[PDB]
């Protein structure tokens, strides 16, 4: 499946320029919104927005381009069609068969932060790692009851390589007998994950 | 601003002086690929995507030309207003949980990069380590600054204190983030 790109229009007659086309999908492709943005030194000066239907100046720099691009039917029609030829095409194709089908499973390991001593305070970490995609539920239990006091998780940590990571700490005191279980739920899992640590 | 998924097709970036360019595709935060402007091929971050999808790199190379023009036009049109340099911020963290003697990977997340010219290097006990360094490309932020992650593969031990050296015009002296 081949991917198409948004086509930068040509400007009319250290410094940083950036141009991007962005595709905003809601409920698959039942709602698609399309924005292209032209940025010069962290300031966006023109913009196509499919809700609006035509390039509009965001700043004073942007009037020349917007008024002209809108005047050429070959230019304007090219940009409007990018909602179908870039956004919808891509999602129905490339994305549907790659990222949208990606399911990488959580690696769940429990750890005690300081050597065990019954009737003494320690902290248990449940490292949940190498997963995709991001929607993940991670809860702690002592003996079957959800423990919410003394629990702290990291925010979702984006690894940068199409995997995510989250670390959930529990504060506790191991009594003799008790069972602590990390309870993980993730779309790549048939049934949830429970990992136990016998005190 | 509000959706389920956000694909950003066709992100192009161009800078002056020096004539630097980056062309990439992202989806839900992650880089699908970048076009190598010198080797003129599409480099997929996940190999297994490349075997199932594809992209004519000329699409990138053309876009970069357009931008190169537009930057040139826009420089003149604003009486050459230059970029305010920002101070960037490092964050080191392991990719896996640390187990002594088992090979892992250390990740340096560098954010608020602007402009996207940055030297990011690794120290181990204050000496240059480059064992299996992979750098990602500049990712875009909603405020038009950039982030970028380095990677260092290492064997964890006790006798190792690792640093993350980051150099940039927005920093008087180079900032080190210890781990």
């Amino acid at each position, epitope marked *: 499946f081949e991917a198409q790109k948004a086509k930068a229009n040509k400007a009319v007659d250290h410094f940083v320029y950036q141009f991007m086309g962005e595709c905003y999908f809601t409920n698959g492709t039942q709602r698609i919104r399309y924005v292209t943005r032209y940025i010069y030194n962290r300031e966006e000066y023109v913009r196509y927005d499919s809700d609006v239907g035509e390039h509009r100046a965001v700043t004073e720099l942007g009037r020349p381009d917007a008024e002209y691009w809108n005047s050429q039917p070959e230019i304007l029609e090219r940009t409007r069609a990018e909602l179908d030829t870039v956004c919808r095409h891509n999602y129905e194709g490339p994305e549907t068969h790659t990222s949208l089908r990606r399911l990488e499973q959580p690696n769940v390991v429990i750890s005690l932060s300081r050597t065990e001593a019954l009737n003494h305070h320690n902290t248990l970490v449940c490292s949940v790692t190498d997963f995709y995609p991001a929607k993940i539920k991670v809860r702690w239990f002592r003996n079957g009851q959800e423990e919410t006091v003394g629990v702290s998780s990291t925010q979702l940590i984006r690894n940068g390589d199409w995997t995510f990571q989250v670390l959930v700490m529990l504060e506790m005191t191991p009594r003799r007998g008790e069972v602590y279980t990390c309870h993980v739920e993730h779309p790549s899992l048939k049934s949830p994950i429970t990992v136990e640590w016998r005190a | 601003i509000e959706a389920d998924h956000v694909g950003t097709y066709g992100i192009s970036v161009y800078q002056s002086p020096g004539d630097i360019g980056q062309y990439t595709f992202e989806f839900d935060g992650d880089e699908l690929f970048y076009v190598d402007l010198d080797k003129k091929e599409t480099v997929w971050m996940l190999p297994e995507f490349g075997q199932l999808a594809s992209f004519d790199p000329q699409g990138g190379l053309q876009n970069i*030309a357009v931008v190169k023009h537009n930057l040139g036009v826009l420089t003149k049109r604003s009486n050459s207003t230059p970029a305010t340099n920002e101070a960037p911020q490092a964050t080191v963290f392991p990719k896996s949980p640390v187990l002594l003697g088992q090979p892992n990977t250390l990740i340096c997340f560098v954010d608020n990069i602007f402009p996207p010219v940055i030297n990011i290097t690794w120290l181990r006990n204050s000496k240059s380590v480059a064992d299996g360094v992979y750098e990602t490309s500049f990712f875009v932020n909603r405020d038009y600054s950039f982030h970028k992650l380095s990677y260092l593969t290492f064997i964890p031990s006790d006798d190792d204190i690792y640093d993350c050296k980051v150099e940039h015009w927005g920093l008087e002296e180079p900032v080190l983030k210890h781990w």
Partner: T-cell receptor
Amino acid sequence: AVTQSPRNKVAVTGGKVTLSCNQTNNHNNMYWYRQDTGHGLRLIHYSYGAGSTEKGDIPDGYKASRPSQENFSLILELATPSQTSVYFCASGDFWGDTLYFGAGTRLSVLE
Amino acid sequence: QVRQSPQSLTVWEGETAILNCSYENSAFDAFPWYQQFPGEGPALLIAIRSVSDKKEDGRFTIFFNKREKKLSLHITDSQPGDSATYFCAASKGADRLTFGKGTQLIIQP
């Protein structure tokens, strides 16, 4: 307008032939084709701006060069007989629906 | 690859000339025809995008057919001065064009 020079050239083998094309349209892209009976219009090299070039479908034997927005040259360093042909320049806008061709250059590379 | 047929075609004046063309790559979406008179360079004549099954300008029309990946240029009431070589190109996402071998057309008086 798109003007090529020379319009006709006779070169010997191993000889250097440089076809050049000028372009009044302020078009950003330029292209170099060759025409032959049995092959059609085949894209040799092309370009998006001064200082850049791109391989076309039959770039072997030819070296391109675009020193200007206006002008795009095609250089034949070691001219071989198989390069006897009719050469066409073209230009257009970024993503342009339309190409604008020059008149042509009849080139004979003889033995 | 883009393929036209025949290599050469001969039609009586006034009859309709049918010039066939077909393409491999289904990713293509733009199909301009160029017209080349002897001694001149080829020049855009008429064109179609693939979202459409027909484009009609004057005596020249293109009939397009995405499912069969086949393409067609009709010239009605042909005149002697319509005789030239006719190229079929294809474009994909607005990148460079790929032309076919070209069809010669002679209009007999």
